[PDB]
Amino acid sequence: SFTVEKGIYQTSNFRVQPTESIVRFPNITNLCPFHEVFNATTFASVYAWNRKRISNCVADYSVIYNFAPFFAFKCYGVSPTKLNDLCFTNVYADSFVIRGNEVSQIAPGQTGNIADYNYKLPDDFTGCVIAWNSNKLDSKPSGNYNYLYRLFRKSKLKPFERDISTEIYQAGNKPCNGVAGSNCYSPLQSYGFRPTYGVGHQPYRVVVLSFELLHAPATVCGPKKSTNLVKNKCVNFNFNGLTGTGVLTESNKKFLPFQQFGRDIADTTDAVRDPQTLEILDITPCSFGGVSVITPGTN
Amino acid sequence: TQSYTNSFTRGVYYPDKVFRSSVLHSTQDLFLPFFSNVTWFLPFNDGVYFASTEKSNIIRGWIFGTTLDSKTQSLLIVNNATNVVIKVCEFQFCNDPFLDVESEFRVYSSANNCTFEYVSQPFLMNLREFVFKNIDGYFKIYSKHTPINLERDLPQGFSALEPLVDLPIGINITRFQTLLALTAGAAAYYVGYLQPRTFLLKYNENGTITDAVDCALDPLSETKCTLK
Ligand SMILES: *[C@@H]1O[C@H](CO)[C@@H](O[C@@H]2O[C@H](CO)[C@@H](O)[C@H](O)[C@H]2NC(C)=O)[C@H](O)[C@H]1NC(C)=O
Ligand SMILES: *[C@@H]1O[C@H](CO)[C@@H](O)[C@H](O)[C@H]1NC(C)=O
Ligand SMILES: *[C@@H]1O[C@H](CO)[C@@H](O)[C@H](O)[C@H]1NC(C)=O
Ligand SMILES: *[C@@H]1O[C@H](CO)[C@@H](O)[C@H](O)[C@H]1NC(C)=O
Ligand SMILES: *[C@@H]1O[C@H](CO)[C@@H](O)[C@H](O)[C@H]1NC(C)=O
Ligand SMILES: *[C@@H]1O[C@H](CO)[C@@H](O)[C@H](O)[C@H]1NC(C)=O
Ligand SMILES: *[C@@H]1O[C@H](CO)[C@@H](O)[C@H](O)[C@H]1NC(C)=O
DSSP states (O other): OOOOOSEEEEEEEEEOOOOOEEEEOOOOOOBOOOTTTSOOSOOOOSSSOEEEEEOSSBOOGGGGGGSSOOSEEEESSSOGGGTTTOOOSEEEEEEEEEOGGGGGGSSTTOOSHHHHHTOOOOTTOOSEEEEEEOTTTSOOSSOOOSOEEEOOOSSOOOSSOOOOOOOOEEOSSSOOTTOOBTTEEOSEEEOOOOTTOOTTTSOEEEEEEEEEOOSSOOOOBOOOOOOOOOOSSEEEEEESSOEEEEEEEEOOOOOOTTOOEEOOTTOOOOEEEOSSSOOEEEEEOOOEEEEEEEEOOOO | OOOEEOOOSOOEEOSSSEEOOSOEEEEEEEEOOSSOOEEEOOBOTTOEEEEEOOTTOOOOOEEEESSSSSSSOEEEEEEOSSOEEEEOOOOOBOSSOOBOOOOOTTTBSOOOOOSOEEEESOSOOOEEEEEEEEETTEEEEEEEEEOOOSOSSOOSSOOEEEEEEEEOOOOOOOEEEEOOBOOOOOOOEEEEEOEEEEEEEEEOTTSOEEEEEETTSSHHHHHHHHHO
16 A cells, blocks of 8 residues: 555565575594505505405595506596595495506496406496506516416406416317317416517506495495584575574583483474584574564555 | 293494484384394394303304305305405315314315405404395494303393494395304304384483383383374
């Protein structure tokens, strides 16, 4: 209306706005050690590849890039930037040494000697592939013969399988009888590494990271950052999975050593312990109320 | 060596990790019913109540497993002077597994693969009460060490069972056994079971449970629960 009589009218409401945000989370202590899968100085042979399981720790992938320029850094199922934002149940690391020009066969759907006789990958592999040159450390002028690889096999390999059986690969009709010679060849053949070899024949070190999910708790997740702690101001907060808006003040509650939160008669949170530093903090809502306009008649 | 005796008002644990002060709360969870059978000296069912009062600490360790053999995963706990070891290895146990004090050949014949480990302070350190429950891929335990005057039965009193540790294992438990360390000796312990019930807990101003009411024991308790 365009005319107002004498009286008091309730018009609107108001609420104090938040100023900033606060995020708190426990200390990062159980670092997943990746400086052991990297730096082995001994990567064994491709036909006998080590498998290592990483579990029950915080995994930071920033330390991966701290090494030399990687010849091949390919990620298939996960965005490299989002490695710290998505987490899985367990992670498997596989390491070995192959030739320079055989790197292209370590990938899903590839076909080749190293692909189907020593290390076979599944079609839906999820993870990244690491490959960098190591000529200066795995080469001698005399010649290196400690890095073998399979050459003959009766059949192919199922994905994620190993075979160490060393028997005479029979090719002729007559029995080999466990001796070598005509149509009876040893299946394992050794590489040769010298400092003068051209690129494509120098030794290369390969590390493969695999992620998977199954019906179990994750128990392995990336490092989660946190902010500082502010008090006596209308602020937002996320105290280890609990979200709310209010003012943090000092509290005088005797929490037992195993509670994390506090409640009242009406089932509302009113006390939280700081995860980083054990201390009881009391929360109160930010002020609000109605607004009334007092006016005589517009006449 | 079966025997039977009353249970009285024992076996109440904190349902969660929430702090409350001077507030009566109602909970619907698994508890030991008041005034019930407890066997005196093993299917797991849905929970176990465990107690013992011998100082010699001959009882040490509980073997949780579905088959009690090397076929299926088994949870092994050992409490000794230094630490505690928790494994998910499928050991091959014996008919009467007991410690030698310290070869484990009598406890189990052989060990094999497993994918989880743990080490911490030993649980043991008078009547000691324990509760073992497993759910949603998590094996939670509770305990309480209480000094008890010279008595031949469970005292008339209340003692809450605080949580100790939770493990994300996710394996079923159907049977469990006892372990002793040995010369002839004697042991005394009790076994109880957990049942889905509804209680009414009372909190003091310091956040400790001091009293409880069973909502199905008798009509008066039902009236108390209804009136809160
Ligand atoms: C020890 O290793 C065996 C494999 O040699 C594990 O068996 C696997 O268990 C998982 C989890 O139940 C299954 O998903 C796989 O299909 C199993 N594979 C095989 C080949 O058995 C076993 O779980 C490991 N741990 C124990 C305690 O035995
Ligand atoms: C990792 O590489 C550095 C680079 O020289 C080396 O000093 C360190 O000893 C290595 N760690 C190992 C081999 O464990
Ligand atoms: C987390 O780190 C800070 C900084 O050193 C330390 O003061 C605090 O005690 C740590 N948290 C715990 C629970 O120890
Ligand atoms: C406790 O003892 C046995 C346990 O099976 C049972 O038959 C009995 O009814 C129970 N109650 C009493 C009072 O003995
Ligand atoms: C207790 O058991 C652990 C299990 O490895 C062992 O390391 C420790 O030495 C044992 N304590 C003593 C006193 O032998
Ligand atoms: C335990 O066995 C039951 C059937 O006997 C099955 O339903 C359940 O999933 C199993 N739990 C495990 C393997 O954790
Ligand atoms: C709660 O703790 C305070 C401070 O320690 C104490 O004075 C009070 O008696 C306690 N209340 C109890 C034990 O009921």
